[PDB]
């Protein structure tokens, strides 16, 4: 809970000397009491500070606590609350859709800070975010291939939670599992249309995330070798 | 932080029957987590105590409280704070540079509880206080010895903070110091055109200050009767 | 302190029989006692002999006594010092932040001997150095090919500090914080328009530094491979 | 030697950044080669440092530096020397004299650093200080008064040093050999038609010297009594 309380302490400091107000770092208080009292998760935590933040426009003074702390998980959720709020000022159901599993997969990984959840969460995010950046811009294959990225995100995300699970307990041999997610990801992201490239890269960042929450890269290192000369 | 505990137990009881609103009472809990939580220092839980009261104009209930739990650094505090809206409302500036060097130092001894600046604070305010009381009565010869004992003040203040913490490890003989301090002070005191009298009194109460801080007060009898004899 | 030593006696031979004058001895003998005095590093000591040879115009027998001790630290210190100067009698602004750049990452190598930094700054140096040449015999796509080598060194140069603070204590394994490295590189390098190619070069230059500073080359050689691999 | 090394350092870094020219720090430089290899003392030292800044008009730099480093002999030395050329621009003999004695304590305190005679050394040379002043202020007083302080010291300073010599090895009990030189120098100053109170304020403050050189303060304090009552 070092993040929390420094995130209060932060808060704390700026609603001082003028900057955010009151309220923020009255409720960063009472959630800081709640959890550690054992009566909420850090989820709802982040979720009520990123909804206070956006109800009173200081987004960004929360961005810049997040980032001063130096959280990934939270600076995570206010990207994909502030994307999802976007995509409805828009109005497109699939980016709604990939925002709304990009959150579920952020609070799975929130429960206890898996980092294979947080990669795939991360990569549908920057990718929306990248769609929104190139909508404005106007460069429809840029957004195709963004498309593609997300459509391989989707098909992967479930495998890798599931990877993540079997090797916790089951006892298998990592570099199996891997290989098998693998292939299983390219197989089902061409069965959509979709190359077996750009999946391929979207697979290989999901071998990588894998390999740093499960404690071991020497097998991570040597899927993505075997990627490697796949993509030739 | 019996005293803090005891400061929100009573302010509880006071916002229970009446009397005070209960935004006081709030901030009182807040600040008790936050403080014992490591997370701000108890000056700021005063501070902001305070600031409250004279928003809401209630500031005497705060002064019974204070009182009734015996706190010394708080009270001082609280009668610093309203001798420097007073004096904001008249507009004198050497005043306001005393009670800002009285606010810096009672900061200063509320950091570790230190007796000896909270001794030198006292006195700045008191001195403040005596000088605001003159101006409406108008007896000028009271009001120039203020501005004395004032002036001596503000010079014995470094001396005195300092000779605490070369007292504190450095193993010096503390009555070898505390008279160096006093014929400093005297001195220069007498060099800004004040009498080796009042100024005598200041130094006589500041090295009584100091005795009590330091659990010696042998010493700084012994120095109370060199400073009586040279009075003579 | 022993190259400094070297450096000071050469010297010493040098003004006896002719060739340099005696300032440049007599400087060297005084920053010699400063230096294994404890009052000054290194890095003043080159820079002042380094300032002095060229106000006196005998550098080049400053770097044929730097060669004979063998000292990588200083001719590379020297060769950027020489460059700024060309560069200042030029008038052009990258190259000026370029070599400034390089010079301060020289200084913190030579704060500790740290071997990536200087890889980093030889780099810089030596493509700044082409990029002269190349001025005067005027092939553009040279030098736009070495504007995109030093952006990519540019680049590198935080990630390359970072990995080998972190390596230093944190304890992580060399071979994952190296291909992430060279993947952000690559990454960051590919955003400014540059190919992944010549950006590639430079990524495994500075990974070969990496490798060689760290003690440990097994994981520089792989890295290495997984970049050859890359490049296809 | 730590203050020696310590200026050097200083006056390097002063030098490197513009200031002061090159030869006060080549000179600090050899000068602290030769002490600490045994060939010259450090009055030596301080003295051609000060005739250095003498002859630059830099004197000033000199004088913040040793204050920086806190050194009181040397910062003492510097006011000697600079007093004695202001009166030699002036040309009165008394304070010739006065100035000569106060450098011959300063070198015998220099010596083995001997608190006493440098507080013999300060007095004299405030005392003319002040008399340079009031020369172009006008107060003749004041110039009166100030002789008479200078007479009692030039008497004191014999007895003083001899008191401290005989205590170092002779073993008399300090209070009776300090209260003995204090009436030895007030009846000797009233035998100059001197009153016996300013010259009782010169030995009291060449007591506290006493008693701080000698590690016994105590008899020192009794004595400061006794000539308090005295002046009664
Ligand atoms: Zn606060
Ligand atoms: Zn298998
Ligand atoms: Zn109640
Ligand atoms: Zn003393
Ligand atoms: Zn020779
Ligand atoms: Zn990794
Ligand atoms: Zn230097
Ligand atoms: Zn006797």
Redesign the pocket.
């Known amino acids: 809970t070092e993040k929390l309380k420094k995130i209060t302490k932060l808060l704390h400091e700026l609603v001082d000397r003028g900057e955010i107000p009151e309220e923020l770092a009255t409720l960063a208080t009472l959630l800081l009491y709640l959890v550690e009292k054992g009566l909420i998760s850090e989820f709802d935590f982040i979720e009520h500070l990123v909804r206070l933040a956006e109800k009173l426009g200081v987004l960004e003074e929360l961005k810049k606590v997040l980032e001063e702390v130096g959280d990934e998980f939270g600076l995570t959720l206010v990207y994909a609350i502030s994307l999802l709020k976007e995509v409805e000022k828009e109005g497109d159901e699939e980016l709604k859709e990939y925002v709304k599993l990009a959150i579920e997969t952020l609070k799975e990984a929130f429960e206890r800070k898996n980092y294979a959840l947080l990669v795939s969460a991360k990569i549908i995010v920057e990718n929306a975010e990248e769609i929104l950046k190139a909508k404005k811009k106007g460069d429809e294959e840029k957004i195709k291939e963004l498309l593609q990225r997300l459509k391989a995100a989707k098909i992967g995300t479930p495998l890798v939670r599931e990877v993540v699970e079997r090797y916790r307990e089951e006892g298998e041999p990592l570099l ?2 891997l ?2 997610m693998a292939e299983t990801t390219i197989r089902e992201s061409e069965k959509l249309g979709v190359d077996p490239r750009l999946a391929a890269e979207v697979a290989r960042e999901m071998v990588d995330g894998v390999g740093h929450e499960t404690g071991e890269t020497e097998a991570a290192f040597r899927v993505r070798r075997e990627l490697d000369t796949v993509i030739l």
Chains 1, 2, 3, 4 share one sequence.
Do not use: F, G, V
């Open positions: 199996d599992l290989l098998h």
